[PDB]
Amino acid sequence: NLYFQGMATFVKDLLDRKGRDVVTVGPDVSIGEAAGTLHAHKIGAVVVTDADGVVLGIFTERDLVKAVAGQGAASLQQSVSVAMTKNVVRCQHNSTTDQLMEIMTGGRFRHVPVEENGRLAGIISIGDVVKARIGE
Amino acid sequence: ATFVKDLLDRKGRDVVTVGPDVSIGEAAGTLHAHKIGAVVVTDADGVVLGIFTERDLVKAVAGQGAASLQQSVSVAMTKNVVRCQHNSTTDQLMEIMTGGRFRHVPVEGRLAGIISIGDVVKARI
Ligand SMILES: NC(=O)C1=CN([C@@H]2O[C@H](COP(=O)(O)OP(=O)(O)OC[C@H]3O[C@@H](n4cnc5c(N)ncnc54)[C@H](O)[C@@H]3O)[C@@H](O)[C@H]2O)C=CC1
Ligand SMILES: NC(=O)C1=CN([C@@H]2O[C@H](COP(=O)(O)OP(=O)(O)OC[C@H]3O[C@@H](n4cnc5c(N)ncnc54)[C@H](O)[C@@H]3O)[C@@H](O)[C@H]2O)C=CC1
Numbered sequence: 115n116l117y118f119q120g121m122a123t124f125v126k127d128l129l130d131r132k133g134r135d136v137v138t139v140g141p142d143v144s145i146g147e148a149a150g151t152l153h154a155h156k157i158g159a160v161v162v163t164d165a166d167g168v169v170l171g172i173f174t175e176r177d178l179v180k181a182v183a184g185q186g187a188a189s190l191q192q193s194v195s196v197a198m199t200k201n202v203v204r205c206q207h208n209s210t211t212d213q214l215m216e217i218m219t220g221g222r223f224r225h226v227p228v229e230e231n232g233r234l235a236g237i238i239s240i241g242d243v244v245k246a247r248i249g250e
Numbered sequence: 251a252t253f254v255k256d257l258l259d260r261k262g263r264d265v266v267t268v269g270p271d272v273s274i275g276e277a278a279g280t281l282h283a284h285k286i287g288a289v290v291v292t293d294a295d296g297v298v299l300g301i302f303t304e305r306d307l308v309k310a311v312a313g314q315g316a317a318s319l320q321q322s323v324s325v326a327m328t329k330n331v332v333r334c335q336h337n338s339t340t341d342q343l344m345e346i347m348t349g350g351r352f353r354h355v356p357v358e359g360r361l362a363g364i365i366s367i368g369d370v371v372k373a374r375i
């Protein structure tokens with residue numbers, strides 16, 4: 115496939131518009147507090163990192179639902195580590211908004227962390243992708 | 251690939267609903283069994299009373315922790331529900347979702363389906 119210049123087609127482009135920052139929680143935070151962080155920052159996702167900066171996993175509103183479905187009130191006390199998804203799929207600065215959609219559709223998740231040089235460098239969400247395919 | 255009617259022919263006309271007295275905890279149980287992110291709140295008569303998602307679940311537990319699971323779905327749901335029609339387009343949908351900052355738009359004087367941001371996306375590929 116082949117693309118033109120400044121049509122918001124690449125991950126690098128989306129980052130320039132929205133921002134490079136990522137909100138994170140540590141692994142020993144409880145489920146109930148991860149949810150409180152979701153709400154104060156108005157986001158659907160938080161990346162789980164350790165003392166040293168390693169990505170451990172990813173927790174979203176959808177993990178919240180599964181947790182309470184299965185174990186009710188008690189699950190708010192449990193550590194974010196038992197509900198989070200450990201195998202985290204990523205993209206690169208040069209990934210395209212087309213690939214991204216196919217990853218999100220096929221894998222059935224809505225958040226993709228951006229990597230470069232083994233580093234965490236931002237996060238792209240389905241709502242970013244969608245806005246890009248309109249805003250001009 | 252581009253009307254609401256087209257999307258419903260591919261995915262289905264059905265909608266998953268709960269009553270208003272169901273607790274937030276049980277609402278959450280329904281979301282998981284059906285693998286969906288939202289559930290439309292209707293009365294004994296069939297009228298749409300609001301919409302409740304995984305996002306309202308987050309706001310509830312953030313504010314009042316374990317006790318919120320006991321509360322009725324009615325105090326956490328969004329009462330003012332925006333909708334689309336059989337002949338709404340893919341484009342318009344995207345702007346409604348982006349501007350309003352939500353991800354589900356019920357199809358309509360009767361309820362006749364529901365469209366989510368994931369549907370719209372898969373249709374554009
Ligand atoms: N009006 C706008 O500019 C935007 C509107 N939306 C709408 O908001 C609703 C919810 O959005 P979703 O994309 O489903 O995602 P979301 O609500 O999880 O994310 C919202 C924004 O926060 C960012 N974000 C998510 N997790 C983050 C983290 N850990 N650290 C830093 N930033 C993070 C995402 O990039 C996204 O731009 C949707 O209906 C969508 O259409 C989403 C993005 C932008
Ligand atoms: N493979 C496929 O055909 C689809 C894949 N997806 C992917 O799944 C993940 C979550 O999808 P979202 O679009 O955020 O929404 P969602 O998880 O709320 O929707 C999943 C499916 O359920 C439907 N749905 C939701 N609430 C319903 C209700 N009350 N009654 C009847 N049907 C209902 C939606 O139309 C969609 O087909 C995303 O990561 C997305 O990329 C989403 C839809 C279809």
Ligand SMILES: Nc1ncnc2c1ncn2[C@@H]1O[C@H](COP(=O)(O)O)[C@@H](O)[C@H]1O
Binds near residue numbers: 159173174227
């Ligand atoms: N990058 C990712 N890799 C694998 N699973 C993910 C990723 N992001 C989210 N998920 C999972 O997909 C499910 C629904 O995610 P979401 O659409 O991201 O709320 C949750 O279990 C998430 O943990």
Ligand SMILES: Nc1ncnc2c1ncn2[C@@H]1O[C@H](COP(=O)(O)O)[C@@H](O)[C@H]1O
Binds near residue numbers: 302306330333353
């Ligand atoms: N079609 C809609 N019209 C109005 N509000 C909605 C609609 N869909 C969801 N909401 C609400 O907006 C927020 C985001 O929902 P969602 O992105 O669908 O998980 C939640 O507080 C919902 O109660």
